[PDB]
Design an enzyme around this catalytic site. Structure first.
Site, short mmCIF file in Angstrom:
data_model
loop_
_atom_site.label_atom_id
_atom_site.label_comp_id
_atom_site.label_asym_id
_atom_site.label_seq_id
_atom_site.Cartn_x
_atom_site.Cartn_y
_atom_site.Cartn_z
N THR A 191 -6.72 -5.05 0.88
CA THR A 191 -5.53 -5.32 1.69
C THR A 191 -5.70 -6.45 2.68
O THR A 191 -4.78 -7.28 2.89
CB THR A 191 -5.15 -4.05 2.42
OG1 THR A 191 -4.96 -3.00 1.45
CG2 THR A 191 -3.83 -4.19 3.11
N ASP A 251 0.82 -1.20 0.00
CA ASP A 251 0.00 0.00 0.00
C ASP A 251 0.87 1.26 0.00
O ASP A 251 0.61 2.22 -0.74
CB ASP A 251 -0.90 0.06 1.23
CG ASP A 251 -1.80 -1.15 1.35
OD1 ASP A 251 -1.25 -2.20 1.75
OD2 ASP A 251 -3.04 -1.11 1.16
MG LIG Z 1 -6.52 0.44 -0.13
#
Ligand SMILES: [Mg+2]
Ligand SMILES: Nc1ncnc2c1ncn2[C@@H]1O[C@H](COP(=O)(O)O)[C@@H](O)[C@H]1O
Ligand SMILES: [Mg+2]
Ligand SMILES: [Mg+2]
Length: 302
Positions: free
Chosen positions: A116, A47
């Site tokens: 995620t 990320d």
């Molecule tokens: Mg995200």
């Protein structure tokens, strides 16, 4: 100045670079997991690195854009910079309604890794990279990279794909397919459910309910006919979750709103939270909209 199409063509290549980063983080083994607000609200090395790559790459070429990314990050390695662009996309004429856009009026909404939680669980094909482009508060172009597309096909397979679209041109990189006739297959969150989410779904008379990660992934399920509606009667997702995916869905005749039927807005000052949830379908949107209970609506303020 051909701003929109230049932006889309660069975003396509930038998203491909992001996919290489997503795969590299898994391959090197250390996900660098940071917990944000809870154990289901995670941030990994992918990320952070992807966001650095996307934002620095876009800002380098298009410094007048407003760019808003999910992660709240504090010098970027040149290795993360993508300078390429799709020559093929650059050959396509801008839709006339967008031909006079000024760069300073575009707002780009970035989800560097969407899904995620599922990424950390090894549900790798749930993961997408989302680059959404808005003008006058409306989402008009989008790039979705799916880094682990095709990952179950063996060592000789090519990994990943990039889906892109522009309203007035279409959406590309997948085969459009309607969901099975005669069925209601409702898709929703895997990791962020609650009673309201499941009660709203029950009111739809589902034949099957899919629980999977990712806003991008669920829009892909809609356009590929794996689900007939995406119903998430809850706060929790944000503008970067819905911007690029709604473009892809709208480009092939679908519809994405909040649970009440309101379109989502994407101007630079809008609140990030989608506080009244998400309702989306490729076909038969009005059926699903009609089934949202009033009690669910009173609970969810836009
Ligand atoms: Mg995200
Ligand atoms: N309650 C929540 N807290 C943090 N993120 C959420 C929440 N609900 C949904 N999301 C995010 O919105 C996107 C779609 O949610 P999901 O369908 O659970 O994968 C993902 O990026 C999620 O992480
Ligand atoms: Mg998140
Ligand atoms: Mg997301």
């Amino acid at each position: 100045h051909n701003v929109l199409m230049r932006l889309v063509a660069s975003a396509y290549s930038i998203a491909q670079k992001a996919g290489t980063i997503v795969r590299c983080v898994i391959a090197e083994g250390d996900l660098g997991i940071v917990q944000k607000t809870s154990a289901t609200d995670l941030q990994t090395k992918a990320d952070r690195m992807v966001q650095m790559s996307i934002c620095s790459s876009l800002s380098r070429k298009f410094p007048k854009l407003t760019i808003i990314g999910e992660e709240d990050l504090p010098e970027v390695d040149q290795e993360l910079i993508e300078d390429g662009q799709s020559e093929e996309i650059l050959k396509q004429p801008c839709p006339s309604q967008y031909s006079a856009i000024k760069e300073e009026d575009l707002v780009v909404w970035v989800d560097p890794v969407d899904g995620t939680k599922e990424y950390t669980e090894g549900l790798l094909d749930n993961v997408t990279v989302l680059i959404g482009i808005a003008y006058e508060g409306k989402a008009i172009a989008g790039i979705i990279n799916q880094p682990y597309y095709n990952y179950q096909a063996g060592p000789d397979a090519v990994l990943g794909r990039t889906i892109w679209g522009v309203l007035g041109l279409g959406a590309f990189g997948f085969q459009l397919k309607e969901a099975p006739a005669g069925k209601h297959i409702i898709t929703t969150t895997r990791s962020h459910s609650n009673k309201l989410v499941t009660d709203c779904i029950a009111a739809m008379n589902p034949d099957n309910v899919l629980r999977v990660g990712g806003a991008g992934n669920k829009i892909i399920q809609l356009i590929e006919g794996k689900a007939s509606a995406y119903v998430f009667a809850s706060p929790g997702c944000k503008k970067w979750d819905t911007c690029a995916p709604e473009v892809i869905l709208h480009a092939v005749g679908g519809k994405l709103t909040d649970i009440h039927g309101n379109p989502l807005q994407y101007d630079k000052e809008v609140k990030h939270m989608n506080s009244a949830g998400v309702l989306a379908a490729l076909r038969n949107y009005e059926y699903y909209a009609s089934r949202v209970p009033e009690s669910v609506k009173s609970a969810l303020i836009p």
